[PDB]
Curated annotation (Swiss-Prot), chains A, B:
Record SUPFAM superfamilies: flu NP-like (SSF161003)
Family membership: Belongs to the influenza viruses nucleoprotein family.
Ribonucleoprotein listed as a keyword: yes
Organism from which the protein derives: Thogoto virus (isolate SiAr 126)
Official protein name in the record: Nucleoprotein
Subcellular location: Virion
């Protein structure tokens, strides 16, 4: 799984820099890298969406004199590589999952800046529970490639689309339901997901309430974003389950070669925290946890007004970061609810004893059981510089979230 | 389009004065300006409806001695500019979008004086919901120019007309249906607007019931009327999204040079409020909102009888106006309906909880989402003299309208 990650990141960075440097697009602005990387990812999987030559919003200017304008680029050299890597045997079939992870990681900043809740609204559930709707808008090939990374609400949204309206339909539905059951480890949650499978959305609001109470399994992987990938000069130990990502992106931040854009310079901390969220998928993480891990407060979306249009986004400052603790990406569910003798032997022996002596109701019982869980996570934290086990004790911004 | 607005008022105003000055028509009578402007706006889009020379009811008389008579006017000098401005590159194609804004606002007075409900009656719905039936009687070219300003009911009527009237049908209806969906932000409304697409008008009464609950998005633009345009001598900072319009037409009120016409002098307060109602598109706005915004009580149409004939509309007094607050135009719907953690990070952290644990019904479920809403607007109102955020606190005339 992690064997092809280093060369994957290396060639991603190579194309990242090549497409920008072909037309003198500076890579020290966040918007330039974000747009170019979005074009590259469009080339990666949905090859028919982007254009071989097209104009996009970029920052043209030397030494801080960048102004918004549209620059034509020749994506065909990158298109050829993207289409040729689709079924290259060198990836051992991990090209599609890697691209799914890349798209899921890189489709976050626009959603954060333009606060929208499409999956929950289409599912007619609580909008604040989009926190379980990761992986929306990804390619169907990618969604089957990393369905575990695709959040439970996105899979349930696909199932709802199937119900609202051929063995391919059966295969898609069974994959969706299996991944729903895998992500939602709740037994009552699983049974009511099965109810959704045949179609019973009276528990859909109950599904939202459970997700709020019982937290489904969310698989994750540490994948950097376009600006940091373009600014990353080390990929020797590029794996997905260690501190290599943390150390590399900390070094990138210490380089201080990347500038972020926003409506006004007050958004500098907001963009730094957005970078942190995008790198570590911690958009839904508790703000106290993030403040303790990265040694800095995380500004909520409420602290800032509407994000200005991408046309009028302007450079607002250098990207900065610090952290003191790390951890592996979460594999299983963050919340987990996981004296007598049996003689098979006719002969008399002395005896020895250690001991002297509705469906919605079950769903709410599981909800309260996961309320009884005061600990979150599976194994431990790890301190910066190694894999020494650490545990977060508590913070002022505990129980608070970016959109909470 | 705001940047090009300043040039666009001036050339509208140029032909306003020339038509009246040709036959010595005084411009200090609203009835003279109301008809002359209706002729001027007629040449803008409906070029073949008006006549090159024709007689209309005006007030002829020097210094307050105006007696009503039909006056022939040389409209041919004013005809050429209107058609030339249709595709003049100076507007860069904004002439139709502006003329749709211009045509809608200038027909408000006649509807108020002769209280009729053409859209709701043809839609066989409640007549109290003409607030959402804006944009009726406008040219289809203008209706395709600013369909957003044209209320959904008129589009719904056009949708009903299109079903009760060819590849051109789809093109017109998709704009009709799309702007029905755009204006009515109701998710259940959109599905039941989609029911109206092929003629399932069983929810048409439900739509009226929904309209009482969900207020569809009605885009507003601070467009001036005929008497004020001729009496406005400043257009340098003409913008449709600031207080320039509010400050500009207050100076006209300070001049006290414009006279209003009506059956009798009791309408002087009513006619003054008609100017307030028409300019800011607040005919259906809460009278509690209006009395607070403009610092004056608004007389309802019930306080006055039938309007006198257009052949007997006599001058009743001078136009006066005052205001203390304003707001950015209502771009979205006045009523809008826009807690957990996703740990993507394997660290062992304390679990935190911000909590403890028919299709007509869905429309009614969405209906209750908008009865519960009390605050009206997009962000807030603003005080006179700037864009300082001032929230509407309430008044005695809340939940009361001009026709309420």
């Amino acid at each position: 799984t992690e064997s092809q990650i280093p060369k994957m990141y290396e060639m991603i960075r190579d194309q990242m820099r090549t497409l920008a440097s072909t037309h003198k697009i500076p890579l020290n602005i966040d918007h330039n890298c974000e747009v170019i990387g979005s074009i590259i990812m469009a080339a990666c999987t949905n090859n028919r969406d982007l254009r071989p030559v097209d104009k996009y919003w970029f920052l043209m200017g030397p030494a801080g004199a960048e102004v918004m304008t549209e620059v034509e680029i020749d994506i065909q050299p990158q298109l050829q590589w993207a289409k040729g890597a689709v079924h290259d045997p060198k990836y051992k079939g991990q090209w599609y999952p890697f691209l799914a992870l890349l798209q899921i990681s890189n489709k976050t900043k626009d959603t954060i800046l333009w606060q929208k809740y499409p999956v929950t609204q289409e599912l007619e559930i609580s909008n604040s529970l989009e926190i379980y709707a990761n992986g929306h808008g990804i390619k169907d090939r990618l969604k089957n490639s990393r369905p575990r990374s695709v959040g439970p609400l996105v899979h349930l949204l696909h199932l709802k689309r199937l119900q609202e309206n051929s063995p391919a339909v059966n295969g898609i539905r069974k994959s969706i339901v299996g991944h729903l059951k895998r992500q939602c480890i709740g037994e009552t949650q699983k049974a009511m997901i099965n109810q959704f499978e045949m179609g019973r959305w009276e528990s859909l609001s109950t599904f939202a309430a459970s997700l709020l109470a019982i937290k489904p399994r969310i698989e994750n992987h540490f994948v950097l974003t376009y600006p940091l990938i373009a600014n990353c000069e080390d990929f020797a130990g590029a794996t997905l389950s260690d501190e290599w990502v943390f150390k590399a992106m900390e070094k990138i931040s210490n380089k201080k070669t990347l500038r972020v854009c926003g409506p006004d310079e007050k958004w500098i901390s907001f963009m730094n925290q957005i970078y942190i969220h995008s790198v570590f998928q911690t958009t839904g993480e508790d703000l106290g946890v993030l403040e303790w891990v990265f040694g800095g407060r995380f500004c909520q979306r409420k602290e800032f007004g509407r994000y200005c249009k991408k046309s009028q986004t302007k450079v607002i400052g250098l990207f900065t970061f610090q952290y003191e603790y790390w951890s592996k990406p979460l594999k299983s569910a963050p919340r987990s609810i996981e004296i007598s003798c049996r003689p098979s032997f006719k002969g008399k022996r002395p005896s020895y004893n250690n001991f002297t002596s509705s469906f919605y109701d079950q769903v709410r019982e599981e909800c309260q059981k996961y309320m009884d869980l005061k600990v979150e996570g599976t194994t431990c934290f790890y301190r910066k510089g190694g894999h020494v086990e650490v545990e977060f004790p508590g913070s002022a911004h505990c129980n608070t979230y970016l959109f909470g």
